[PDB]
C-alpha cells in the first residue's frame, strides 16, 4: 500500500517538474526566438 | 528572470519530491 502511494506521489512530483521544465525551455527558446 | 524562475522551479520540484517521500513514510507508518 505504502509503496504504491509513494510511486504515485513520485509520479505527480515528476509530472510537475517535467511540465514546468518544458514550459521554461519553451519560454527560453522563445526569448531566442523573440 | 527566466533563469531565476527555472532555478526556483528546480528547488520547488526537489521540495515536492521530499514532501512525497515524507508523505509516503507517514502513510507507511500509519499502516
Swiss-Prot record, chain A:
It is found in: Nucleus. Disulfide bonds: none annotated. It comes from the Eukaryota. Component of the RPD3C(L) histone deacetylase complex (HDAC) responsible for the deacetylation of lysine residues on the N-terminal part of the core histones (H2A, H2B, H3 and H4). Histone deacetylation gives a tag for epigenetic repression and plays an important role in transcriptional regulation, cell cycle progression and developmental events. Component of the RPD3C(L) complex. This is Transcriptional regulatory protein dep1. It comes from Schizosaccharomyces pombe (strain 972 / ATCC 24843) (Fission yeast). The gene is dep1. The chain holds residues 311 to 344 of 491 of the full protein.
UniProtKB/Swiss-Prot annotation, chain B:
It comes from Schizosaccharomyces pombe (strain 972 / ATCC 24843) (Fission yeast). Component of the clr6 histone deacetylase complex I composed of at least clr6, png2, prw1, pst1 and sds3. The chain holds residues 108 to 138 of 267 of the full protein. Component of the clr6 histone deacetylase complex I responsible for the deacetylation of lysine residues on the N-terminal part of the core histones (H2A, H2B, H3 and H4). Histone deacetylation gives a tag for epigenetic repression and plays an important role in transcriptional regulation, cell cycle progression and developmental events. It is found in: Nucleus. Belongs to the SDS3 family. This is Transcriptional regulatory protein sds3.
Amino acid at each position: 500500500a505504502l509503496l504504491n502511494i509513494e510511486t504515485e506521489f513520485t509520479f505527480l512530483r515528476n509530472r510537475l517538474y517535467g511540465k514546468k521544465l518544458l514550459k521554461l525551455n519553451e519560454h527560453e527558446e522563445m526569448i531566442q526566438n523573440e | 528572470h527566466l533563469n531565476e524562475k527555472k532555478r526556483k522551479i528546480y528547488e520547488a520540484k526537489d521540495m515536492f519530491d521530499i514532501g512525497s517521500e515524507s508523505s509516503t513514510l507517514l502513510l507507511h507508518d500509519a499502516s
